[PDB]
Design a protein around this ligand. Structure first.
Ligand code: OQE
Ligand code: OQE
Ligand code: MG
Ligand code: MG
Ligand code: MG
Ligand code: MG
Ligand code: MG
Ligand code: MG
Lengths: 231, 19, 231, 19
């Protein structure tokens, strides 16, 4: 890899600079370089990894959505709208595969604490979810089951090892509920999960400091917003 | 927080409107 | 070039799709491919070329500004902030050089109508201006004179061949006034140009249709906003 | 138009504040 010659600390430093500059492609390349040093990632570093790739794939998804809609709307268009949509799709799949590769080599393997293991399995579920959004048919089924399996393992650990207000646990539940609604054709599961997650978090807010309270209630608000949209 | 909530709502609403 | 196998019409079509998707890097690569077909560009195509590269270099400039400020603020930092700022700088210079290359091969050469020739010379001034923002010393002087020369030729043609409300003429004057203020250490020239441009455009608005009026007054408003900032 | 004017003002103001 092209980051092989750069110090791990320098890669992390530059990932933070790239974040400040909203240079998310660079940020992701720096964090990929950091992961490929072979050492575990700290909490802050895990967040940098996620922010980088979530923003990269977010841009790709947004573009894919613009093009997909144009495609579906097409007077004979020629092959160009399809071609360009496929170009973006392929690039998106490439980024997902890169992330999935990092998590499989060897972030998940070496993650023993709940905070890291749940985080990485949530990511695994997320990037399979993004692959699922652009997939068709039988390939879609396997991708969807890969997402489900990762989220489910993360859910099982989070329920055992983390309080109901833990932001990682909450963001996992949020995303798994989105998976149910948008990917798995399971709106009732989505709603049930979001509601139970919200209610169990509400009942644990009393334990929290001002700062932790703010972190937890943000994700709770997102659960509630989704519920309002879905009901 | 308002911005985060707004951005989330846009993404989620797209799916619903797509159908 | 990688776009060598794609039809010119398909490249233009995809540039418009990329614009809709805010995929400006793609848009620029498609338009570069189109220019390299060797034919002149229509008015709409010239605008696509400009929108693409202005947005690409705009992102690079914005990032450079974030990093430059961090750099100037630096407890011993190590070489990383400088290195990353230099990386962005080099990429920015690369994009400017690409644009300048397209204009020199052979857009300006073949541009005989005022609307095209002024447009391309304004672009030439702009991309030299962007190179000037990150330049130092003697290299800076030559770059600054290259910008000035291009803008000046464009100005001379625009005054001879276009009415004072022509949006291309107005945007050229706007940008040349910015060059004077920000690059050439000539704030009085900047102010004088913006004012004279505004006043001569005001006196020609009466000739315009509703639609042309809206186009012209937008750039006039930008001249006035700049004047307010500078005075 | 407001957005175009706002975006322009931000870019121009940066130079002034940079000095
Ligand atoms: O704002 C969105 C909308 O959706 C996306 C937009 C871009 C990229 C990815 C996704 P998503 O994975 O589909 O949710 N989501 C993030 C919600 C969130 C905010 C703060 C803390 C935790 C979660
Ligand atoms: O909004 C900006 C601020 O500045 C830039 C931001 C990004 C890229 C380039 C530049 P600039 O070349 O330095 O002006 N400028 C464009 C102003 C304009 C709007 C509409 C019509 C004509 C002109
Ligand atoms: Mg080392
Ligand atoms: Mg495909
Ligand atoms: Mg249950
Ligand atoms: Mg042909
Ligand atoms: Mg340099
Ligand atoms: Mg004069």
């Amino acid at each position: 890899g092209a980051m092989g010659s750069m110090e791990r600390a320098s890669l992390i430093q530059k990932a933070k600079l790239a974040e400040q500059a909203e240079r998310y492609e660079d940020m992701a390349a720096f964090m990929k370089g950091a992961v490929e040093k072979g050492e575990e990632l700290s909490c802050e570093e895990r967040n940098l990894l996620s922010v980088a790739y979530k923003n990269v794939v977010g841009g790709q998804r947004a573009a894919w959505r613009v093009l997909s809609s144009i495609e579906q709307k097409s007077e004979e268009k020629g092959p160009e709208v399809r071609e360009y949509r496929e170009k973006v799709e392929t690039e998106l799949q490439g980024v997902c595969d890169t992330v999935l590769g990092l998590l499989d080599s060897h972030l998940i393997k070496e993650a023993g604490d709940a905070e890291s293991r749940v985080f990485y399995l949530k990511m695994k579920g997320d990037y399979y979810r993004y692959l699922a959004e652009v997939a068709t048919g039988d390939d879609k089924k396997r991708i969807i089951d890969s997402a489900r399996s990762a989220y489910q393992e993360a859910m099982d650990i989070s329920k055992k090892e983390m309080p109901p207000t833990n932001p990682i646990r909450l963001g996992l539940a949020l995303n798994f509920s989105v998976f149910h609604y948008e990917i798995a054709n399971s709106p009732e599961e989505a709603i049930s999960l979001a509601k139970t997650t919200f209610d169990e978090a509400m009942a644990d807010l009393h334990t929290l400091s001002e700062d932790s309270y703010k972190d937890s209630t943000l994700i709770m608000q997102l659960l509630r917003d989704n519920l309002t949209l879905w009901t | 927080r308002d911005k985060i909530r707004l951005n989330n709502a846009i993404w989620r609403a797209w799916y619903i409107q797509y159908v």
